[PDB]
Design an enzyme around this catalytic site. Structure first.
Site, PDB file in Angstrom:
ATOM      1  N   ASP A   1       0.829  -1.193   0.000  1.00 49.87           N
ATOM      2  CA  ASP A   1       0.000   0.000   0.000  1.00 49.87           C
ATOM      3  C   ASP A   1       0.870   1.252   0.000  1.00 49.87           C
ATOM      4  O   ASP A   1       2.049   1.218   0.358  1.00 49.87           O
ATOM      5  CB  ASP A   1      -0.973  -0.010   1.188  1.00 49.87           C
ATOM      6  CG  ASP A   1      -0.269   0.007   2.537  1.00 49.87           C
ATOM      7  OD1 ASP A   1       0.976  -0.013   2.578  1.00 49.87           O
ATOM      8  OD2 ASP A   1      -0.973   0.034   3.568  1.00 49.87           O
TER       9      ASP A   1
ATOM     10  N   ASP B   1      -1.897  -3.064   8.002  1.00 44.49           N
ATOM     11  CA  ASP B   1      -1.730  -2.629   9.382  1.00 44.49           C
ATOM     12  C   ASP B   1      -3.071  -2.483  10.090  1.00 44.49           C
ATOM     13  O   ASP B   1      -3.147  -2.593  11.318  1.00 44.49           O
ATOM     14  CB  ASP B   1      -0.958  -1.309   9.434  1.00 44.49           C
ATOM     15  CG  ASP B   1      -1.539  -0.254   8.515  1.00 44.49           C
ATOM     16  OD1 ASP B   1      -2.593  -0.511   7.897  1.00 44.49           O
ATOM     17  OD2 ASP B   1      -0.939   0.836   8.408  1.00 44.49           O
TER      18      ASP B   1
ATOM     19  N   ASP C   1      -7.737  -6.145   7.872  1.00 45.00           N
ATOM     20  CA  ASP C   1      -6.765  -6.733   6.965  1.00 45.00           C
ATOM     21  C   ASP C   1      -6.465  -8.188   7.289  1.00 45.00           C
ATOM     22  O   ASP C   1      -5.672  -8.811   6.576  1.00 45.00           O
ATOM     23  CB  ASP C   1      -5.454  -5.935   6.983  1.00 45.00           C
ATOM     24  CG  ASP C   1      -5.511  -4.700   6.110  1.00 45.00           C
ATOM     25  OD1 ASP C   1      -5.309  -4.830   4.885  1.00 45.00           O
ATOM     26  OD2 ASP C   1      -5.751  -3.600   6.649  1.00 45.00           O
TER      27      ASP C   1
END
EC number: 7.2.2.13
Lengths: 31, 960, 288
Positions: free
Chosen positions: B313, B654, B658
């Site tokens: 990301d 994080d 997720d």
């Protein structure tokens, strides 16, 4: 006279050659 | 057991305050009393039980029993057999423990490499103390995505769900609330059980139980090697019994046949292969951890070298997440932000009400209260702990505002709502500074397009004039112009509610949004830059040449996403998407051929309507793929779809949302300085820094194992042929036995088992990151190209080196090689004390055996001598020694110590009676030099041809 | 174990199976050419007449010609079939000691009939031709009372234990240079012999250990020194080494007797580990 060989002299000389190699190895990793 | 009663009688039960908590001093009085907040680990072995669990324990107890019987039999009157059995168990036992007490001291060091934190409120102040330093009295503030430090009693919940998942095992998250609901503590709402994760929302509670008195207080490589060991052990046992029966047929007193049996079994199996594989993985895991790259399992170390795709990301990973404002667009005016302590340039007026109007919204929502005593430090460098976008907005504004603490104290809040990565709204109410207009304020974190669809009148020089049909076109023009610089624009709207319809004492809610915000006023957009990290372009360049397809999954506009991807290097110079081709020739995108474009930028909302086939063809058709303003559910979508074509995907995350992505992926990467506990515990990898340059160096380290582990297997298997060939010619050719059993125990359990570790300290070659990733299915650690090199090429040269020493000694003592064939029948006959040599001399039985045992010693020394070149050529399998160097001092240590051991066993007095090792003359130490020089010369040429023409016949059948 | 692994449609576990076989044939052929080359070069440094080292051949061992399986001689002096193996070995060994084979033809020579000094026939080189060897007459052993040219252990006595000394190339044994030694022969004299004696294992065994009677050259117990030094198989083929027959006359029937025969000297040395160096042991028992 080709019937006696100087053993106990190769032993002393050979063991010195063993100590020399063994000591160098220690004096190489500690460095 | 405190949910039934109220908070005031439990808040005073521990001398705690509902707001101030405990003092900083009272904690130590009870921390030293109750002890650390942790569970009780199982009792530890005194380190001598585990030592005796490998020497005497296991299937090897029979050798210890057998060793004793031989020693007693020799005592009452055989001694050779006792020493062999004693030496086998001691050497193997003391080696399997040295490589196990070493990995344990390393794997146990990761439990403290990254600690566990908890948010505790003491003396009206919060701090991030260690989770073990939690008293049974203080006040802790738990947040969504974190784990509770101890048993809690929620005193102020704010719509939070806690996933127990440990007592009942259900993954459904129970909602929590401060009001008592059930009498049973197992099904109440006040009590939060220890060792559980708060998924969503937030809450605050008083610890009631810590430590023991809590609710909870009451690899593929190791398989392939293990399978291969059993395969080669079966051959050893089959050959051992075949030669055990055959020797008894010729007649060998049943003791000389057992000594033969041990010499065949030991000479065919790698006696410590499994121990090297286990320690080599742990050595790299420690080496990988020195770099900011932590692994939880030992299988992740096995993986990460076969990685084929990294789905990272943008914010935090490839960028510092420290943004600074650089341009603005308002009143149809372009602007350029210049920041200096003296405010030079005067690029904008500092008297319009627009500035204060747009500052009143972001400056009040900052949860970061500045530390006292930092006023001397310039306000630009005054660290802010909050949302990065609002932090940058404050830093843009705080350069102007004089008193910030007074500004924060002037207006207050009524209720706060949790933020979401997909909802993208955080609504709050702030009192208007104007006294006549007793209205409220609205805060919204939205995209400029969303606020344009939400607003109908724009603010320009004071009044909300209606929008114009050319204003939207100018808006898009400036939007593209600012997004082409790799900067994200922000849309934040603040509005004043109608005074008549919003009374002066209204107490609204937060869950149900009954707030009138459509067709409100807006001023302009502000853009801020998020520069990439220092070593990100180098890592991206390395991934391109290593066959790693890096995919960037960001959460902003496609234009900004493409600009940032081009900046880091995801979209390499020489590639363009279909829109870039269309804009080049001014053609509609719908008619542009999509085969000449190797890059694509996919919208997040556009991704929801794709089927599996569409995602699969997108992945297979493009080589530089980025995803724009997508959600982590879509991140799971890519992770599931990317590995459908046999790719080892390593996704990073994080947030609390997720875990499905981090569990589905082959490698799950978390964050050590910005990752939540849920992601940090659902992942197989923690990055000590959020650099993305540590994933690539982690891949290199995981790639280096498969090279060094291959080298340490070729070296230990090479010494198998020289140890099994002598017994083959001893029977087939009928010659005196050229190799004893303890002599085999020195080649196999000595200069081959132990020096193989020294090859695990080698450095990466010159092409470690310049070759395609290995397929974990069609690429094996031990393959036909490695057996063909150890058992067929270098093993044969070593065997001839030992055999040359065998013929030199016998020839020099009288027995020329011509008449050595067929002499085995009389040589081993105890009754033939007048055997005739080639000179006519006659030898007694014990006079030949001294000469034979001297050949055994020279065979051992010759194998050691030819293993100097074997260890040197195993340093590299593609490079050359002259272009790699003798850097590691362990391999040189092994060469100088295996030679000293060889020069000690032969020359120490008394070794001719126990080990049957006799001194050898200085001329006999150089018999293996011609063959040792041949190994180095032959392999250097082979690695020279292999480099000149890659993919040739040499690389096809000899590149192990 | 799958059937679809030996021939799909190309070949058996590989394509054309040829570039590997050609490589190993050349690799092993070249490798075998280096092994032969090093072996040959090593043979240039080896003398053709004497060994490079002779220290491993200690003072030569002493062996008795009846090849006995466990250093034991057990038989019965009545049934003939018991001693076929014992006497057939002696006959086979002594076929080279017969007079009909020791013709001269510039091979043999009529040596001294009295123990003489060792014979130096020249240096161990090919500058001279072959060497002439002293001939040994089989009649020198004989028997006290029996047949002519007899090598049998019949009802009376036991087979003649022919004692020989292991040949060592270029070895000149030295008898002890003193008088009144551990041996006490009637015809005792230091030069030109090498004393031997077949005593008993223990004082228990020395009791009725028998009248050990020796049959050697010069009628003295020892090896005549004119047959030394041995010059090697290449220089002295058909070399007839000295023998020493020992015949036991009166021993306890149906009793195991352990006999330890030594060979005293200055060059000769004994070893605690090698029981055949300098001396040898033999157990003989006749059954009633």
């Amino acid at each position: 006279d080709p019937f006696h060989y100087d053993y106990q002299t190769l032993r002393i000389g050979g063991l010195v050659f063993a100590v020399v190699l063994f000591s160098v190895g220690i004096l190489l990793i500690l460095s | 057991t405190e949910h039934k009663m109220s908070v005031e009688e439990v808040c005073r039960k521990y001398n705690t305050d509902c707001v101030q908590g405990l003092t900083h001093s009272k904690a130590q009085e009870i921390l030293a009393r109750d002890g650390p907040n942790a569970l009780t680990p199982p009792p530890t072995t005194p380190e001598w039980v585990k030592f005796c669990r490998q020497l005497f324990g296991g299937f090897s107890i029979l050798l210890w029993i057998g060793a004793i019987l031989c020693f007693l039999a020799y005592g009452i009157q055989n001694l050779y057999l006792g020493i062999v059995l004693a030496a086998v168990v001691i050497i193997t036992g003391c080696f399997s423990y040295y490589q196990e007490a070493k990995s344990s001291k390393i794997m146990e060091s990761f439990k403290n490499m990254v600690p566990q934190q908890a948010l505790v409120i003491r003396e009206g102040e919060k701090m991030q103390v260690n989770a073990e330093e939690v008293v049974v009295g203080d006040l802790v503030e738990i947040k969504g995505g974190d784990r509770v430090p101890a048993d809690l009693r929620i005193i102020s919940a704010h719509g939070c769900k806690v996933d127990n998942s440990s007592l009942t095992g259900e993954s459904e998250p129970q909602t929590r609330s401060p009001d008592c609901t059930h009498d049973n503590p197992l099904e109440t709402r006040n009590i939060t059980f220890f060792s559980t994760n708060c998924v969503e929302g937030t809450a605050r509670g008083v610890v009631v139980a810590t430590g023991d008195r809590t609710v909870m207080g009451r690899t593929p490589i190791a398989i392939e090697i293990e399978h291969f060991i059993q395969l080669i052990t079966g051959v050893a046992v089959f050959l051992g019994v075949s030669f055990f029966i055959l020797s008894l047929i010729l007649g060998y007193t049943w003791l000389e046949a057992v000594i033969f049996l041990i010499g065949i079994i030991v000479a065919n199996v790698p006696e410590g292969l499994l121990a090297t594989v286990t320690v080599c993985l742990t050595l790299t895991a420690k080496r990988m951890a020195r770099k900011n790259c932590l692994v939880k399992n030992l299988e992740a170390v096995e993986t990460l070298g076969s990685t084929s795709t990294i789905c990272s990301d943008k914010t935090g990973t490839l960028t510092q997440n420290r943004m600074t404002v650089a341009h603005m667009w308002f009143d149809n005016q372009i602007h350029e932000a210049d920041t200096t302590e003296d405010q030079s340039g005067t690029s904008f007026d500092k008297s319009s009400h627009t500035w204060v109007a747009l500052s009143h919204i972001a400056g009040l929502c900052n949860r970061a209260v500045f530390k006292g005593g930092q006023d001397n430090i310039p306000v630009l460098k005054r660290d802010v702990a909050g949302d990065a976008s609002e932090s940058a907005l404050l830093k843009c504004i705080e350069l102007s505002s004089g008193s910030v603490k007074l500004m924060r104290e002037r207006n207050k809040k009524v209720a706060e709502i949790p933020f979401n990565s997909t909802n993208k709204y955080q609504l709050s109410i702030h009192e208007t500074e104007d006294p006549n207009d007793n209205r409220y304020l609205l805060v919204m974190k939205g995209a400029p397009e969303r606020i344009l669809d939400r607003c109908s009148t724009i603010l320009l020089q004071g009044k909300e004039q209606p929008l114009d049909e050319e204003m939207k076109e100018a808006f898009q023009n400036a939007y593209l112009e600012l997004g082409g610089l790799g900067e994200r624009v922000l849309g934040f709207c603040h509005y004043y509610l109608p005074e008549e319809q919003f009374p002066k004492g209204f107490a609204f809610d937060c869950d149900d949004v009954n707030f009138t915000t459509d067709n409100l006023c807006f001023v302009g957009l502000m853009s801020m830059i998020d520069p990439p990290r220092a070593a990100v372009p180098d890592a991206v360049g390395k991934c391109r040449s290593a066959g790693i397809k890096v995919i960037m999954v960001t959460g902003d506009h496609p234009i900004t996403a493409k600009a940032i991807a081009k900046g880091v290097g995801i979209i390499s110079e020489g590639n363009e998407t279909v829109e870039d081709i269309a804009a080049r020739l001014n053609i509609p995108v719908s008619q542009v051929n999509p085969r000449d474009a190797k890059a694509c930028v996919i919208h997040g909302t556009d991704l929801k309507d794709f089927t599996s086939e569409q995602i699969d063809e997108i992945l297979q058709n493009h080589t530089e793929i980025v995803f724009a303003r997508t959600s982590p559910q879509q991140k799971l979508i890519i992770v599931e779809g990317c590995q459908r074509q046999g790719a080892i995907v390593a996704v990073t995350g994080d947030g609390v949302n997720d875990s499905p992505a981090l569990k589905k992926a082959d490698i799950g990467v978390a964050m050590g300085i910005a990752g939540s506990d849920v992601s940090k515990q659902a992942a197989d990898m923690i990055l000590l820094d959020d650099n993305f340059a540590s994933i690539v160096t982690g891949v290199e380290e995981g790639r280096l194992i498969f090279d060094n582990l291959k080298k340490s297997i070729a070296y230990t298997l090479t010494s198998n042929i020289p140890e099994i060939t002598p017994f083959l010619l001893f029977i087939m050719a009928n010659i005196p036995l050229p190799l004893g059993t303890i002599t085999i125990l020195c080649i196999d359990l000595g200069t081959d088992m132990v020096p193989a570790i020294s090859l695990a300290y080698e450095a990466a070659e010159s092409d470690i990151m310049k070759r395609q990733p290995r397929n974990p299915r069609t690429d094996k650690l031990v393959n036909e190209r490695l057996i063909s090199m150890a058992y067929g090429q270098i093993g044969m040269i070593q065997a001839l080196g030992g055999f040359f020493s065998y013929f030199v000694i016998l020839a020099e003592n009288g027995f020329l090689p011509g008449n050595l064939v067929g002499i085995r029948l009389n040589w081993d006959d105890r009754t033939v004390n007048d055997l005739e040599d080639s000179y006519g001399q006659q030898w007694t039985y014990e006079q030949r055996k001294v000469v034979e045992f001297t050949c055994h010693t020279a065979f051992f020394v010759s194998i050691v001598v030819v293993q100097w070149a074997d260890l040197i050529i195993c340093k590299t399998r593609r490079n050359s020694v002259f272009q790699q160097g003798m850097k590691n001092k362990i391999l040189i240590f092994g060469l100088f110590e295996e030679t000293a051991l060889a020069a000690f066993l032969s020359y120490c007095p008394g070794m001719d009676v126990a080990l049957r090792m006799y001194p050898l003359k200085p001329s006999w130490w150089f018999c293996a030099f011609p063959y040792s020089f041949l190994i180095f010369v032959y392999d250097e040429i082979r690695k020279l041809i292999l480099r000149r023409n890659p993919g040739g016949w040499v690389e096809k059948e000899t590149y192990y | 174990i799958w059937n679809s692994e030996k021939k799909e449609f190309l070949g058996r576990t590989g394509g054309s199976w040829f570039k590997i076989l050609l490589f190993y044939v050349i690799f092993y052929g070249c490798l075998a050419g280096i092994f032969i080359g090093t072996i040959q070069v090593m043979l240039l440094t080896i003398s053709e007449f004497k060994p490079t080292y002779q220290d491993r051949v200690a003072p030569p061992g002493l062996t008795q010609i009846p090849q006995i399986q466990k250093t034991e001689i057990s038989f019965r002096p009545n049934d003939p079939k018991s001693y076929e193996a014992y006497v057939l070995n002696i006959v086979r060994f002594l076929e080279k000691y017969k007079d009909s084979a020791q013709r001269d033809d510039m091979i043999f020579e009529d040596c001294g009939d009295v123990p003489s000094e060792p014979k130096e026939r020249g240096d161990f080189n090919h500058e001279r031709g072959e060497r002439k060897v002293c001939r040994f007459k089989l009649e020198w052993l004989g028997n006290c009372s029996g047949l002519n040219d007899e090598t049998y252990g019949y009802k009376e006595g036991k087979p003649c234990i022919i004692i020989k000394l292991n040949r060592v190339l270029g070895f000149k044994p030295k008898p002890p240079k003193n008088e009144s030694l551990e041996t006490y022969p009637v015809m005792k004299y230091n030069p030109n012999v090498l004393p031997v004696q077949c005593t008993g294992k223990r004082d228990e065994d020395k009791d009725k250990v028998g009248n050990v009677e020796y049959f050697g050259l010069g009628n003295s117990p020892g090896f005549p020194l004119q047959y030394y030094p041995y010059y090697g198989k290449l220089l002295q083929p058909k070399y007839l080494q000295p023998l020493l027959a020992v015949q036991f006359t009166n021993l306890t029937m149906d009793t195991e007797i352990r006999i330890e025969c030594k060979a005293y000297g200055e060059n000769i040395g004994y070893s605690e580990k090698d029981r055949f160096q300098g001396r040898f042991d033999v157990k003989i028992e006749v059954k009633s």
